[model samples]
Target: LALAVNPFDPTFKADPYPVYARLRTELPIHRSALGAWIVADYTSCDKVLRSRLFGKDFANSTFFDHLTSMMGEDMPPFLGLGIDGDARPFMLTDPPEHTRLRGLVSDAFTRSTTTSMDDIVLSAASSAVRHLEHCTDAVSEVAEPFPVEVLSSILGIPDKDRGRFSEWSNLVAGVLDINFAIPKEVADRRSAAIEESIDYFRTLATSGNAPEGLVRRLSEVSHGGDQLSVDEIAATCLLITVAGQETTSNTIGNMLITFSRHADQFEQVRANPQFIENAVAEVLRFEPPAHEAGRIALEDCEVSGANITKGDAVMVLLASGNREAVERGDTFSVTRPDVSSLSYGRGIHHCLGSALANSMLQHFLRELSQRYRSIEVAEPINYKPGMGLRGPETLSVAVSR
Candidate 1:
């Protein structure tokens, strides 16, 4: 077996891919120094993600009591990600139910999800590129606007309030990672963000002022349906807003850096603007916004020679798995390719917005390539401290004249 390293380590955190590669070759499944299970093998990773054996809920596990005793009542009992249970959204739940919730909002983001507002992404991107020509601080003012504005308008929220969406998304996404706990200061920010978000949606819902967007439509459905309660409607809207905007924003950022660093690939895209679709898929596979997803073991299962006990916490490392196929020297990142990347996830719990997000990414890249003949990495990319749903905070790029 290969030696294991703590992901919490600063050096390891910066670049875990090389270490993970070694683990995949030598110790595909082994406990870390802290006794947490690590699965680096492709087959093992896929099995845990697809199999019912991995539970999303920790209450069913033996370690639940231990984790609770140490952490106290902050843990919610119905984090209902438990194996063999009802589904939820934003990386929670299982089939039919998961599919239903996703299907409800799928039209907004599908390949055809774009509309007049969709051009906003192109405008935001072009504006960012123009700014890059003028100043060094163009990344934030430019890169974030495209996806963030798209998500806001799609949610029926206005562009004026879109700036705050980044902070709220970061807070919620950070909490999902077991590796990082929300700090007291950040927790307060999260609380405030939630209240603001709810208040924003309540007005939109009550007044039918969702600007002819997804949030308004969802609010209508929730209000009209006898079974849908106000809380459910609020929860659904909040969850999707968080999921759609931040995830896409960060993924786009990752692609920008990836392409900037790989000049050869970037050159190909510049030559053929349509290559944006393939490059987006490749960028996702090369480095996805989401590193891993959480699951609990529901039953004794033997996968890739490792026998996982029932009720154990199993984290599916999708980022690591993507590299496995790529390392073998594969050519491209087409959907349903021989190799699978867990960026959008797998099985019943897969992301409902994957197709829609794909369309947006494709559109963004195609338009981006057509705009500038060249783009260069202007400064070193620095990532945020939190682990979940992360990408470069400010990707400084210099645009070609």
Candidate 2:
């Protein structure tokens, strides 16, 4: 009903809350110009994500074929074919296969899924923020590098080879969008990034010389006599590497942007660091890292007055759905208890590393509060290209210690 939601529209890109408000108020299950269902209301978004009627089922959808085709022959079919081919990481699969893969690699991220995890994040956060007093751009200095360091350490990436991850992670994330309008130039760039990362991990995972970290842990972990193959290990490494980087970094930037605007909230946390548990939750609800997610309908269903047919692409407006959960949704408050959000998503496909991401942010924010009296960020933040994994391209941040 609304003028065919143009998410790529520059205005919407800057501040989508206005349009989100309009859509939730007017039509909750609005159709997109691309013919996908843009579900905005909190209830519908949650239901669709929770419903078995809607699953990733990427094979039947254009998302898997379209994205893999763009990835080029450089990506091994075992790693890049049909997303649900049970070949890629668990994030791209469903049910039994997803269960198998997720279980195998899940413990590698955590120390059996503890203080050990706590210490890793604490050390990484402390080191990353140690230089924040002189940091002007939070994304590059702190947000971007911090998670890569933690993941690389966990993945056993040698210090020498670790520097190349950020470049590949940033470019590879562009391929995550289901826009279908991706230009060839961008596609080619993404292909190259994917190929290079795949090749990099393939070597690390198969060369019989993988450093002792999640790479080895994943290879060693098994589920009922089933162990991950070399390519599976490689793809999982790449997925975790690429997946964890942008979202974690963007979250830090998003949090900085939120707190920089709401100083009282920042001070409230600074005075009592225990406020961070809810502070991070509020940040995830307020200005989440990734803004939108797409799902494929597995069966015909009616949701929020809209008939969603089988194989239809349903794009969940997460930021919009998040706001609808609480009154005064536009306002940012750390103390508000109802900070429930669809940010990390819900159900089986919920983000596996939410705990890791949360730990990274909490430690970094705590470190930030310890060292800084104020975080002053510039207005009009510029975001990365794509609506899928939303993040600031380069957040110009100024901090006072």
Candidate 3:
């Protein structure tokens, strides 16, 4: 089987599972002629992801070298989610660092913290549904308002300026596609977006008051102590905003589209509302937001029967790991699955906002179930032209009033 990367075969964008499944059974670890690794086996995926051999330090990678050469060395540093020793937030750093970063965020993610925001989230969702209800087409309907409302309000972005969100999220997602070598226009736009976002955040950060939100917390962390530098805090927050918005928006659109195609599943969820959480997990596993995450070997090591050299890039097909036969493939029973799915990833770099994501997705499903009998597809679902992220560019569903 031939090896491919995200944005892999544009036509397969809408349905990649066939490709993923075929690759798994036919070729376990297919290496590309370009020296890239394509690890599609469940067992191999897990081993590589957890092993120190599959590191995430890109500072020395040819990819980074090429980027620096073309984009300039002073370009903003990337805050990655690797094992603890690499340095950055816990998301990118492994072990000790990951543990520490998770702890700080966990403190704010307690049951009390999230439960308190239920009304806010619901109200925002309600408003979004209302907007979708009135729209003539699906793309204009739910995509932007769905995630932007939550991210913008949380990050203190004004409601009026939300139109910029779609563009920002698109560019942020595309950044994951380093294969094209970042064109001059794309790089300029990315830089502009970063500057604009930073300038806006600086205002919220230094307003001299802890506004009891993420932005305020970031500023506090930056100014409060030596634990995090200003640039570190900024980069981390940048990643968070993009992460938060991009994942949820795509999920919202994708979930609705899934339900539209599988009316029985939607009806089942509606009838048994308690299944919403499980359904969210299943969605993640079945249609993961990110198809793959890369790791560079820190030192020489063997993974899944393959010997890998130090500094070699090892690819982890998280989506493959989720479907390992060891897991009984029963991960997401029907619409709800267990954590067996690596859709959101695992180990030290597991998703920090997982609870938030679950809560939001569960709420979305619950609300939709309660409000409508079923959903109808308004436009054929279409995914963005990239495999790094499995997101919908247009997901249209019509609900009965």
Candidate 4:
């Protein structure tokens, strides 16, 4: 049995399941060597996430204070890195502001033209499988571009600008990972990307080049006595672009990899297309995309027998929670009765793109199962390193018609 806690290690990055299993069994609420408490079991992870005692606040955080003092207010933006409550986007905000922002934007998501998205997703997945006849890398040809195109359609980003948008989205998404000791070069790249995205989105929000979609709607909506400022709109757009694409893309890559590993299940799904939705749910359980989320202890709290003090950072191991379900003899079934919808989080900060993601993925998976009779790994899988997000960087697979 492999036991490792350092998330940055290559050994852990490649396969952290054994480590998580060990932790869940022995130290469900153990304090790490770094001083942060790691909550591994399902019940505890859910409790911390939904509790009002823990929040996204960084008002008195050492990190927020240090970064603000060093970089000042004009520093490049990083997701979840906030100077204060007002400066950050909704994801990094607490209630009232979080409530207002979520309310203003929730309708726009509900107003999504999802009815037509099924055809688009199926077409995209079909086209991707057709390309698989000549290409081996599913991550590039299928998993990456499928969600990018879907989000591009929703945001009305022009086909010409999509390549650049995809690049920026990937870089910006890196800022959300749990690793704190990012290299200067890496941080610089992410910062630069954030700056560029803000500028580009600002232009899009103001000008005629922007089409009629989520971005335009965000630009128009007013919340709490005033319209969202231009900067707020840009920040919202940045959040939508990264969150919408990165997690969905990671889910697609993971689903394909899971299918390759469980060929019998793949065949089962192909035989009965209705099972694709639940299979996607099972994939989310077995291999979640956004693995962990951080919440600051707003006040003293006790969870899972660990004493979490105020101002301490609690790492909610969502991936570990998923594993806990399976370890409890809950096998990965396409129709697993235990499937819960917490992978995208719960409560006020729940994912806005949840419905859109499910629609696109179910269609994509259905199309994929129908198109490919057998999907097998053509190359070794390589996972992008970090604690927060889990997905294959390059998932190459060979498919048979």
For TM-score, the strongest prediction is: 2
Give the best candidate by lDDT. Answer: 2
The true-versus-predicted C-alpha distance at residue 163 of model 4, in Å, is: 4.0
Q: What is the C-alpha lDDT profile of model 2 across 178-295, one tens digit per residue?
A: 4444666776787677778878887877666677677777777766788888778877877787678878888888888888899989898889877787889889888887777768
Off by over 4 Å in 2: 6-8, 63-87, 112-114, 178-186, 207-209
- TM, every model: 0.81, 0.89, 0.82, 0.88
Candidate 4 at residue 82, lDDT? 43
Error of 3 at 377 (Å): 2.3
Off-target runs (Cα >4 Å) in candidate 1 are: 33-36, 58-91, 95-100, 103-117, 158-183, 220-227, 326-340, 378-380
How are the candidates ranked when ordered by lDDT, highest leading? Answer: 2, 4, 3, 1
- Give lDDT for model 1: 0.60
lDDT of 1 by residue, 128-211 (tens): 545555655433565555556566656666657666665565454433334334456765666566657656666666775657
lDDT of candidate 3 over 101-158, digit per residue (tens) = 6665444334223576678777767666666666655544665556556665555455
Model 4: worst 10 consecutive residues (lDDT sum):
67-76
lDDT per residue (tens digit) for residues 1-401 in model 4: 22425543566767778777778777788665444567888888888888898887554465455434543443344566642344456467678787777777776656655575467666766776677667767677777777777777777787778888888866876565544446678778887888898899889888865876777877767655756777777788777777766687788888877788778888889997878888888888888898787778888988856888888877778888887665443355676655774588766677778878887778777778877899887546798765578888787777788
Displacement of residue 140 (Cα, Å) in model 4 is 2.5
